[PDB]
């Protein structure tokens, strides 16, 4: 009954990320607390149907049966009841815990690169819009002059013809070759946008390969640290 295996906080950090059905079990308040994860906490002859003579008697019955008949909306069973070298298991703890911490920083580093790359990408996209709008104004400007310039020719012509129209054409040439530079400058961003968008995907990719390792590396490290604590609370920190 004591070896049946059965505060609030550490119960949740062992019920953390377990499946739908996993369980475990002020005295002037109540005696024993069943913590079924669907976290549903259930108090505990051991409410009305009291004929179950033990803390192990009451839990076996609901391993087979669901909890819908007892309290209406709990249609879920108690389905999952979740090296002899004491030093060498403790050495392995440090090893896996170094491997966990070491694997975490690689995950944490990437999360920043992801988030910078999100910002740098969208900063490029906004610049593109800006370039596009910039160009629209110069495309409008090379248009705007064609109205007033070639109107001036027809007003007079003879009056300093190539003397005037060269210095109007010179301006018009500087206007268009500047447009050519901007468009070239826009393209050169867009190519880098995809080079960014490529790298961005590769960070996402590597995060998702690092994650399941990170969880299983953590999950092992818990059960390794559980098996040890079955006291020596303060020796753990040197390894850890």
């Amino acid at each position: 009954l004591q070896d049946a295996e059965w505060s609030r906080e550490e119960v949740n950090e062992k019920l953390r990320d377990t499946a739908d059905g996993t369980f475990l079990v002020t005295k002037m308040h109540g005696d024993y607390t069943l913590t079924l994860r669907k976290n549903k906490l259930i108090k505990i002859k051991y409410s009305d149907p009291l004929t179950f003579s033990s803390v192990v008697e009451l839990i076996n019955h609901y391993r087979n049966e669901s909890l819908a008949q007892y309290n209406p909306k709990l249609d879920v069973k108690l389905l999952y009841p979740v090296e002899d070298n004491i030093e060498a298991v403790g050495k392995k703890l440090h090893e896996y815990n170094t491997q966990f911490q070491e694997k975490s920083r690689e995950y944490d580093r990437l999360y920043e690169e992801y988030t910078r790359t999100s910002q740098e990408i969208q900063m490029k996209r906004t610049a593109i819009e800006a370039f596009n709008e910039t160009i629209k104004i110069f495309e409008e400007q090379c248009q705007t002059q064609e109205r007033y310039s070639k109107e001036y020719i027809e007003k007079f012509k003879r009056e300093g013809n190539e003397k005037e129209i060269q210095r109007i054409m010179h301006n018009y040439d500087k206007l268009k070759s500047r447009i050519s530079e901007i468009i070239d400058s826009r393209r050169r961003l867009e190519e880098d946008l995809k080079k960014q968008a490529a790298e961005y995907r590769e960070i996402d990719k590597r995060m998702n390969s690092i994650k399941p390792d990170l969880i299983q590396l953590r999950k092992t490290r818990d059960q390794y640290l559980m098996w040890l604590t079955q006291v020596r609370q303060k020796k753990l920190n040197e390894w850890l």
């Binding site: 906080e9 400007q141 500087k174």
Partner: protein, 1053 residues
């Protein structure tokens, strides 16, 4: 034999930011460059079609440029086609990608944010130039106002138009008793919550009197005159103004009666200022109740007020001049949700942009669930189909819940996952829209990545809505269509079904009335068990017995209003019968204390009726003092609201527009988070409303906003091109840059964002400098330009630190500030120094400089003997004696011993970063205070952890010696018997307010702070406080905890 000759073949030192240990980046004054070149060529597009290219100086004003452009246009062809310069304005494409027209021609080329350096000339279109000063609003906000106008969403566009309701209401309150209420907005009374004085403050008064000093100015306005009153602590400003005038105008040429007549005329023309800062005493409160006085009592100072003519104050104020903006249903009696006779089924269709190693992962699927904070049905997945490659499930998922049983605030939470269980992306959608309309059709949900702390499978705490980031996993899907827009019940309809469910409840067999969720009692022992439940904190999670027990008794639970949080979490929200009943309780439930009611705006209470009642609580009880204490948490809690338009948003917006001291921190807390796409939309629209309605403060904020941007840019360069240069080189660049006219303009005449009470005048650049830290903070210093600078502080100085996420500090400092007020207003003087801290962006902020304070390291470096052997345990004590001598010493040690006790408890409770000689600080007067807290709730327990329950402030010999007035075996004195008793009385005090501290931390989960990802993070503070235990056990627990970290001392009470 060191390494068994084991080579690491991967390793290579060339090619990490571990070496020299940041957050970035941004573009500054032009595209892709931080600061524009000092002389620059700018292409000027004329209306005649000619590009004339001026070399302008970086700093040149648009008037200066226009004037030169039209000089240089005469030399180019088609000049006869140009108007006068006066009939033109500038325009160009900005870094935000908009084509901003440049009206304020006093602005400088560098401050325009120009993208490419070019300027087009135009005759000013849109003849209401007044209306196109929304750039002001857009500059204040950080995104241009036009960026909302081209948003499709009706919610967003409805929020914009609807929320103007609130804006109009508040401007009416302001111009009510003008000019008085206009001054009352701008300069509200900075006033402690209670008039009642704590005993220890009182006893510094001799039976409740203070010596004041009223100042006056007469001719021309140079010489001033002291008028040193000695008035009762609880007499009001108007009485203090009389007595000053009395003495001012007593004479040998004025009889007794003649004085009283000359008092009455003179009396009402003046009001009380604080000498040295823009604070004022504009209403009937006790003098003691104003913060400035109560400080002057505690610090042993003589208040320096000033008599100020009301017409010189109402001279300095402007007109509020609000304007309504340029932006100025239902199909049928549509099919009510309670008719829709079906289960829930949602069609998953396809994810597109999923980034996975086919080599690493076997299979991927979509997880799903319905939620209300906690979940109303059995969770499910779809089958592990088309894994990796293309992910394409054309399944209808089947949820056991009837469609009438969905609560108003129901939400789908989904997550693509890997198999070995492990999430890839996540996203959540509200099953109803803002118009109450059940979601039917096809949605395009773009997803978020899994954060650090959440290793969990699904993430229901996460934000509702799609990701704005396009190139991410877009999992589209389909909802069931029911031949009509399906709308949620009226309250008229919910009430009736409640009155039915209760009238029905009265008539079942008692044979049946034993199903463990229905009451017939109409017992003495039970009623004690219920208030027992009531007293417990939010995180003592409730059992199914207690839930049903509460839910059955729900009508008796009205007697104990404070139970409500526990009751609400006991309702089964999947049972419309229950929910409709609960709706009727909350409709007329006795309003409650804000500290308890704020729980109801956290993520475990997402219903609109509940949250309404909670706002109702704040409208009654929460005062403008208590609001600005908790503002951070209330701005945070907006994130858990389903829709843009809601009661809380309208409550806060009004208060902000009613009180310009709330208004100020309300702006900066929102503006802070504007980088974050989770809230860019929401907080932009909200900040648009504030900025449109807040009066002339918009111009004051724009100057603060312009200053912070200058310093962001400056540090950004220091941290990138000028890394790997000596301080000497760096400073010579910082001094060079801050002397430029654009910097002098931008950084001199404005208000401290840390506290807009203080102005900031000219920059003393000789005291301006970069600190040692590799984050490259600036130590900035300003001339306090007040009339009475000298009476408060001639120099103002604050630290600007581009590089660290201030908002942990910000919160721990907040938490300390609250613990202090709890201790002190409950009669026991410990003295914490919660210095000021303000996050104003992405790891950018401001920290108050406490002058005359030093790291213990400095104490020991200065007072450390030469020929470096060892620092002395006494050289703190010797350094502190060297400052405080006489009866002054005895009181300095009291301060150290009173601060050091409080800082032990808070630190131990909050579990903050390990304290050591370079982050502990002692002041000349002898007070001890901590700085740079790092991670709060024991966040380096993510690595290992597990029942660490750390003591971070461990009183070394250094501190012990000073507490025990220089003795040996400090452990064994009365000096230390006192200290211990302070630490016990402090600890126990916080423990009886532990609901609050949990609750505050609960409301902070919204912020993307690594240290607060989920409620068990918060749960550290339960263990630390021993809330599961009885308080004598808690006491002995604390002793035990403090004794082991110290090794001997603590074992008698």
């Amino acid at each position: 034999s060191y390494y068994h000759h084991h080579h690491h073949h991967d390793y290579d030192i060339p090619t990490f930011q571990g070496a020299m240990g940041p957050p970035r980046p941004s573009s500054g004054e032009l595209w892709g460059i931080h600061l524009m070149p000092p002389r620059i060529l700018v292409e000027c597009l004329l209306p005649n079609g000619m590009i004339v290219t001026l070399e302008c100086l970086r700093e040149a004003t648009l008037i200066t440029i226009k004037h030169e452009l039209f000089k240089e246009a005469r030399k180019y062809p088609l000049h006869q086609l140009l108007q006068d310069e006066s009939s033109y304005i500038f325009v160009s494409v900005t870094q935000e990608a908009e084509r901003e027209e440049f009206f304020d021609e006093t602005r400088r080329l560098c401050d325009l944010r120009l993208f490419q350096p070019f300027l087009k000339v135009i005759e000013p279109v849109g003849n209401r130039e007044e209306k196109i000063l929304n750039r002001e609003i857009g500059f204040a906000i950080g995104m241009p106002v036009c960026e909302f106008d081209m948003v499709k969403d009706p919610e967003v566009q409805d929020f914009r138009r609807n929320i103007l309701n609130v804006c109009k209401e508040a401007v009416d309150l302001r111009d009510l008793n003008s000019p008085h209420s206009r001054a009352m907005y701008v300069y509200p009374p900075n006033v402690e919550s209670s008039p009642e004085l704590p005993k220890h403050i009182y006893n510094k008064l001799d039976k409740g009197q203070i010596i004041v000093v009223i100042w006056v100015i007469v001719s021309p306005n140079n010489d001033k005159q002291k008028y040193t009153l000695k008035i009762n602590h609880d007499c009001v400003p108007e009485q203090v103004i009389a007595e000053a005038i009395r003495k001012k105008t007593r004479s040998m040429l004025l009889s007794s009666e003649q004085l009283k007549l000359c008092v009455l005329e003179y009396q009402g023309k003046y009001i009380l200022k604080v000498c040295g800062c823009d604070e004022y005493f504009l209403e009937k409160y006790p003098l003691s109740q104003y913060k400035y006085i109560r400080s002057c009592i505690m610090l042993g100072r003589m208040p320096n007020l000033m008599l100020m003519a009301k017409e010189s104050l109402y001279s300095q104020l402007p007109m509020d001049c609000f304007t309504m903006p340029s932006y100025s249903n239902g199909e049928t009696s549509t099919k009510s949700l309670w008719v829709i006779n079906s289960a829930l089924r949602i069609k998953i269709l396809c994810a597109t942009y999923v980034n996975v190693n086919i080599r690493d992962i076997d299979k991927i699927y979509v997880r799903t669930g319905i939620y209300h904070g906690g979940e109303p049905l059995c969770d499910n997945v779809n089958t592990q189909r088309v894994p990796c490659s293309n992910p394409r499930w054309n399944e209808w998922l089947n949820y056991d819940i009837y469609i009438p049983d969905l609560p108003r605030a129901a939400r789908l939470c989904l997550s693509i996952c890997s198999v070995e269980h492990c999430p890839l992306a996540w996203g959540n959608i509200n099953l109803f829209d803002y118009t109450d309309t059940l979601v039917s059709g096809k949605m395009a949900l773009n997803l978020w990545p899994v954060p650090h702390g959440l290793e969990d499978l699904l993430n229901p705490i996460g934000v509702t809505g799609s990701n704005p980031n396009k190139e991410t996993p877009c999992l589209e899907l389909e909802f069931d269509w029911f031949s009509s827009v399906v709308k949620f019940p009226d309250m008229s309809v919910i009430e009736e079904h409640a009155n039915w469910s209760v009238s029905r409840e009265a008539g079942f067999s008692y044979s049946h009335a034993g199903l463990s969720n229905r009451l017939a009692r109409d017992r003495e022992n039970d009623k004690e068990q219920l208030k027992a439940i009531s007293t417990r904190d939010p995180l003592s999670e409730i059992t199914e017995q207690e839930k049903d027990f509460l839910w059955s008794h729900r009508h008796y639970c009205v007697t104990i209003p404070e139970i409500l949080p526990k009751l609400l979490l006991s309702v089964k929200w999947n049972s419309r019968d229950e929910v409709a009943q609960m709706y009727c309780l909350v409709k007329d439930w006795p309003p409650i204390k804000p500290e308890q009611a704020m729980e109801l705006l956290d993520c475990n209470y997402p219903d609109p009726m509940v949250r309404g009642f909670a706002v109702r609580c704040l409208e009654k009880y929460l005062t403008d003092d208590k609001l600005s204490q908790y503002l951070i948490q209330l701005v945070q809690v907006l994130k858990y609201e389903q829709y843009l338009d809601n009661l809380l948003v309208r409550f806060l917006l009004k208060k902000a527009l009613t009180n310009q001291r709330i208004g100020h921190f309300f702006f900066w807390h929102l503006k802070s988070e504007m980088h974050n796409k989770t809230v860019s939309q929401r907080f932009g629209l909200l900040l648009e409303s504030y900025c449109r309605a807040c009066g002339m403060y918009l111009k004051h904020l724009n100057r603060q906003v312009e200053a912070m941007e200058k310093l962001i840019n400056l540090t950004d360069i220091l941290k990138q091109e000028k890394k790997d240069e000596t301080q000497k080189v760096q400073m010579k660049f910082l001094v060079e840059q801050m002397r430029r006219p654009d910097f002098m303009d931008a950084l001199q005449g404005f208000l401290s964002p840390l506290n807009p009470a203080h102005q900031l005048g000219n920059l003393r650049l000789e005291e301006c400098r970069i600190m040692s830290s590799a984050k490259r903070p600036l130590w900035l210093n300003w001339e306090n330009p007040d009339i009475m600078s000298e009476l408060l502080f001639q120099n103002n100085e604050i630290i600007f630190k581009n590089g660290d996420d201030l908002r942990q500090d910000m919160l721990t400092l907040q938490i300390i500030r609250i613990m202090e007020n709890i201790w002190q207003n409950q009669g026991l003087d410990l003295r914490m120094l919660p210095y000021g801290c303000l996050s104003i962006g992405d790891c950018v902020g401001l920290i108050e400089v406490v002058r005359n304070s030093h790291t213990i390291m400095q104490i020991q470096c200065k007072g450390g003997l030469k020929g470096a052997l060892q620092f002395n345990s006494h050289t703190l004590h010797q350094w502190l004696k060297d400052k405080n001598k006489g009866e002054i010493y005895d009181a300095a040690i009291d301060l150290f011993t009173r601060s050091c006790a409080g800082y032990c408890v808070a630190t131990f409770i909050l579990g903050i970063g390990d304290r050591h000689n370079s982050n502990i600080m002692v002041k000349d007067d002898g007070q001890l205070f901590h700085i740079d807290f790092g991670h709060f709730l024991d966040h380096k327990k993510k690595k290992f952890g597990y029942k660490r329950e750390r003591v971070p402030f461990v009183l070394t010999q250094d501190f012990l010696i000073v507490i025990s007035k220089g003795a040996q075996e400090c452990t064994k004195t009365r000096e230390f018997e006192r200290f211990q008793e302070m630490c016990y009385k402090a600890y126990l005090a916080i423990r009886q307010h532990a609901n609050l501290f949990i609750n505050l931390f609960s409301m902070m989960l919204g912020s993307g702070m690594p240290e607060l990802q989920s409620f068990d993070d918060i749960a550290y503070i339960r263990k630390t406080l021993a809330l599961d235990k009885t308080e004598q056990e808690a006491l002995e627990y604390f002793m035990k905890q403090m004794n082991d970290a110290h090794h001997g001392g603590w074992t008698t009470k």
